[PDB]
Design a protein around this ligand. Sequence first.
Ligand SMILES: N[C@@H](Cn1oc(=O)[nH]c1=O)C(=O)O
Ligand SMILES: N[C@@H](Cn1oc(=O)[nH]c1=O)C(=O)O
Ligand SMILES: [Zn+2]
Ligand SMILES: [Zn+2]
Ligand SMILES: [Zn+2]
Lengths: 258, 258
Amino acid sequence: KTVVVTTILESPYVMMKKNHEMLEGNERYEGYCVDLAAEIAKHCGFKYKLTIVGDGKYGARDADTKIWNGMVGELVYGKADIAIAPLTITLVREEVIDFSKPFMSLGISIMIKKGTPIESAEDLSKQTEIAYGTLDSGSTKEFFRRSKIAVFDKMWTYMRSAEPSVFVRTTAEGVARVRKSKGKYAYLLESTMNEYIEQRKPCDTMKVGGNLDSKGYGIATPKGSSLGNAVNLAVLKLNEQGLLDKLKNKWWYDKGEC
Amino acid sequence: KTVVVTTILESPYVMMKKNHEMLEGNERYEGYCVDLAAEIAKHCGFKYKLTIVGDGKYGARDADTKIWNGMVGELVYGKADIAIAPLTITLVREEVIDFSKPFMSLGISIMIKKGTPIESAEDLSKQTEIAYGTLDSGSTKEFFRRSKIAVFDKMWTYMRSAEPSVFVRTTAEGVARVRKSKGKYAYLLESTMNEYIEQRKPCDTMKVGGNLDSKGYGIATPKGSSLGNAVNLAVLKLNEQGLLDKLKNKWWYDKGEC
Ligand SMILES: N[C@@H](Cn1oc(=O)[nH]c1=O)C(=O)O
Ligand SMILES: N[C@@H](Cn1oc(=O)[nH]c1=O)C(=O)O
Ligand SMILES: [Zn+2]
Ligand SMILES: [Zn+2]
Ligand SMILES: [Zn+2]
């Protein structure tokens, strides 16, 4: 009956409300995806329960145990009925789960501490003083591990062998590493997260260069789910009406601190 | 059997080659979608025949008869098996045909003759000395007809009742109208076509302001098509291989003449 929604604590998509300990259920959270979940649920006619993914990961298949972790795993093993999060539509995921059309368009980008003498991925590749990495588990890391493009393959060769590790467990961790590294660490992450952080105090980071690729985030459901069709139609309707743009403005720029 | 592909003569997606007179079948054409069709067919294992949509339209439903025209109609009534073209993924279309994940991201934009005193949608709506319109039977026209957003609603009320008509049969007609209007006509079209034309002689037009929305083009198939699943996964593979970005640079950037 009640649809179990798996999501992730990733700002500004889902965050704990300041007074969450005094609130119950869905009311404990706020964010772009919290607002989107309420709308998808109204338009599809279902009751739901927001739940934060237990391992705090997006979703990758372990080469070895072949088990899917993160939000993708929750859907694959039937622990959740739908994922409403900044989950990237990728070929490997689409093979095991269904995705609505994109509710957000984006691409991999570079985040630097202001003043870092880096303007592009080519710049990062040709040097070694400034370290750089990605989220330890996700579509960004996979983009690099599989690129057949020279500059990106060179970047992957470096990243996968860098010691100490240049990979981070969460986006917040990558952001803090950039902030505390005096310009010696650049972070590769999705343009959406980059743009958000650029509008957050202490306003010491910046998005540089163009996006490395083009892709989108989709609402995911277990392969063959009853919800897929309606959820997809809802995403298309909300985009055409302008709600998605409204929500991005609300969470990225209307409340910007810089 | 041989897959009948419906497409549209729209630069730089599908254009007749220079020496087309001495050529046959698929060899008569070139463009982004011609290359995309070859890739899709290779990956999905099918032979095909490129056919240009009979009525030269993208696809809209007649309010009276409820009959679909354009490439959409060809799929709906079984005249074609798949549409590989700059066909916009929309809610009304998604209800009658299937769309793969987007192979290209875009948004509605404004095309002006160089020097025209317009910097955005808001500017067009504020005055009436400069006429502006859209393509007939497409997603752009629907966008303005179904928009509750103040500026867009106002622009639509002007366009709908405009005399002479500000609507055009083909993108080429819209571009030619802007070029010969002495700056008295602006044209609303997708950013993709806009930026392509911006880089072509006589280099007298330009895209102004940001996109009005964010959407994508998808490869479409009739509901229940045996090809749907495979073409969708093929689009995801091409994007990740970097092939889609390669074709985009090939047909837009390289060979840009301004
Ligand atoms: N949305 C990404 C997670 N992730 O966020 C980034 O910024 N990079 C990255 O891999 C995914 O779905 O795997
Ligand atoms: N891709 C559009 C056709 N069209 O091209 C534009 O530039 N505007 C417009 O409506 C469609 O699929 O209807
Ligand atoms: Zn709503
Ligand atoms: Zn290929
Ligand atoms: Zn009629």
